[PDB]
Amino acid sequence: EYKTVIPSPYVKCCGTAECKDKNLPDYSCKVFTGVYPFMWGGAYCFCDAENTQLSEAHVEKSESCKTEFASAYRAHTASASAKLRVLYQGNNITVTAY
Amino acid sequence: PGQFGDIQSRTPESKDVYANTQLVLQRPAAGTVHVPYSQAPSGFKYWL
Amino acid sequence: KDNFNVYKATRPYLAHCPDCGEGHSCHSPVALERIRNEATDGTLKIQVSLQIGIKTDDSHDWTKLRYMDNHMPADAERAGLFVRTSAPCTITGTMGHFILARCPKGETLTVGFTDSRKISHSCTHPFHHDPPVIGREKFHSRPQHGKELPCSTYVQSTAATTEEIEVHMPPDTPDRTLMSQQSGNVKITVNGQTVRYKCNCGGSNEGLTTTDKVINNCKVDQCHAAVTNHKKWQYNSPLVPRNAELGDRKGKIHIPFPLANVT
Amino acid sequence: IGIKTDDSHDWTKLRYMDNHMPADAERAGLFVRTSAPCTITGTMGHFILARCPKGETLTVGFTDSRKISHSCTHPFHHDPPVIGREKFHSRPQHGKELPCSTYVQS
């Protein structure tokens, strides 16, 4: 299972946000325009125009992969073995051999 | 994406990770600061 | 108690919630960041903006939680903390931002608590909860007699080996009540914390203040102000704006209740 | 609800009939339930607004002045209509907006 990592958004008002490509397993970033976000106490910032927001995220393996996972194997040949019970001269002897 | 093997690694300890989730960032709802996205749910969970 | 130390330099935060219980969204002290269901025994691990076990004096008290009230942290009883889906959930333990609970099957998940003013706060998010079938039978409760199969659960340990979340200095916090309008002008009351202000009034004096300052020939509708004096860090949440295109860091809170192999 | 036996207004109290006389009780003890506890959004007089979870029955009740519980249950099929082309159980963080009808607080 994968987890998606989403770092806090960068809000740049009265200006344009920018981002660069990363070499992360699955990553993208986008800049949205015309944003006027609010906080609990009021508008995020002074400017109500020419505002942009930068959003970015990437995919990485979750910490749970140490416990919950499926392994993909190639099979080729197999070694045979058997547990054999032998009655020898009245004695029941069990022997394990390849 | 959405299928078994969507995210892969060679070993449990590897930092070399392949992923194809079709993660797309969407525009935030007006008046909010949240970051919406559209992504295919883990193919591992579906497989299970 | 030693484990709790990582919360000494951090605070609870307010965040947007799509449904505050009225069928309408609002900003709330209660918010859900992540719902983790990696466990196969059906246990849910819920990450919230509240900090459980930490008091506003940074002491450790398992009977108390602390939440953000406007600009300041405030305490409340843990006894008032609840988790619910289709029916009330049983909490197996809590620590910091993380809650463990065993919930009945349902399509939604909500969390809430009673604050210091005896006001109920809650946040509801959509969440499909229907634990995987273990074995070849679909049962609704643990039997007294049966077979033991492999399962995965969240332990009560807080060692949190190599599991961490980032914390850093919070963004400026807007507050419309700072800019009181008196005598036809704007006071930008400091109220004990450094405030950043800007006004569309030829405000060449825009900047930071540590004291009350009247801006002449300017109205409140033309001004914006926010608190900048934040000595304490906050979780790097997707619902909380950054100060800069680069991130502050300054901490790494460990994540309690790791996944483990159980029967 | 919101009215006392002395005919004054008090949003924290309700009045109910008790034999031949009206009597007061706390509004805080008022509840609505269906398949699960229902949220009351507001009250006035004989009318209650609430947002209930899906179920086939609906009941109301309150605690008396003698701390005696009173309740009444009627059959009622509660299953809200689908708005849009998706069936959802709660409002999302992000989505589209469509016209609908509600009861106002007036």
TrEMBL record, chain A:
Source superkingdom: Viruses
Subcellular location: Host Golgi apparatus, Host trans-Golgi network; Host cell membrane; Host cytoplasm; Host endoplasmic reticulum
SS bond partners: 13-45, 14-47, 19-29
Function: Provides the signal sequence for the translocation of the precursor of protein E3/E2 to the host endoplasmic reticulum. Furin-cleaved E3 remains associated with spike glycoprotein E1 and mediates pH protection of the latter during the transport via the secretory pathway. After virion release from the host cell, the assembly protein E3 is gradually released in the extracellular space. Acts as a viroporin that participates in virus glycoprotein processing and transport to the plasma membrane, cell permeabilization and budding of viral particles. Disrupts the calcium homeostasis of the cell, probably at the endoplasmic reticulum level. This leads to cytoplasmic calcium elevation. Because of its lipophilic properties, the 6K protein is postulated to influence the selection of lipids that interact with the transmembrane domains of the glycoproteins, which, in turn, affects the deformability of the bilayer required for the extreme curvature that occurs as budding proceeds.
Subunit structure, as described in the record: Homodimer. Homomultimer. Interacts with host karyopherin KPNA4; this interaction allows the nuclear import of the viral capsid protein. Interacts with spike glycoprotein E2. Interacts with host IRAK1; the interaction leads to inhibition of IRAK1-dependent signaling.
Protein name: Structural polyprotein
Source organism per UniProt: Chikungunya virus
From TrEMBL, chain D:
The species this protein was found in: Chikungunya virus (CHIKV)
Domain of life according to the entry: Viruses
Subunit note: Interacts with spike glycoprotein E1. Processing of the precursor of protein E3/E2 into E2 and E3 results in a heterodimer of the spike glycoproteins E2 and E1. Spike at virion surface are constituted of a trimer of E2-E1 heterodimers. Interacts with 6K protein. Interacts with host MXRA8; this interaction mediates virus entry. The interaction involves 2 adjacent E2-E1 heterodimers.
Localization in the cell: Host Golgi apparatus, Host trans-Golgi network; Host cell membrane; Host cytoplasm; Host endoplasmic reticulum
Name used for this protein in its record: Structural polyprotein
Protein task: Provides the signal sequence for the translocation of the precursor of protein E3/E2 to the host endoplasmic reticulum. Furin-cleaved E3 remains associated with spike glycoprotein E1 and mediates pH protection of the latter during the transport via the secretory pathway. After virion release from the host cell, the assembly protein E3 is gradually released in the extracellular space.
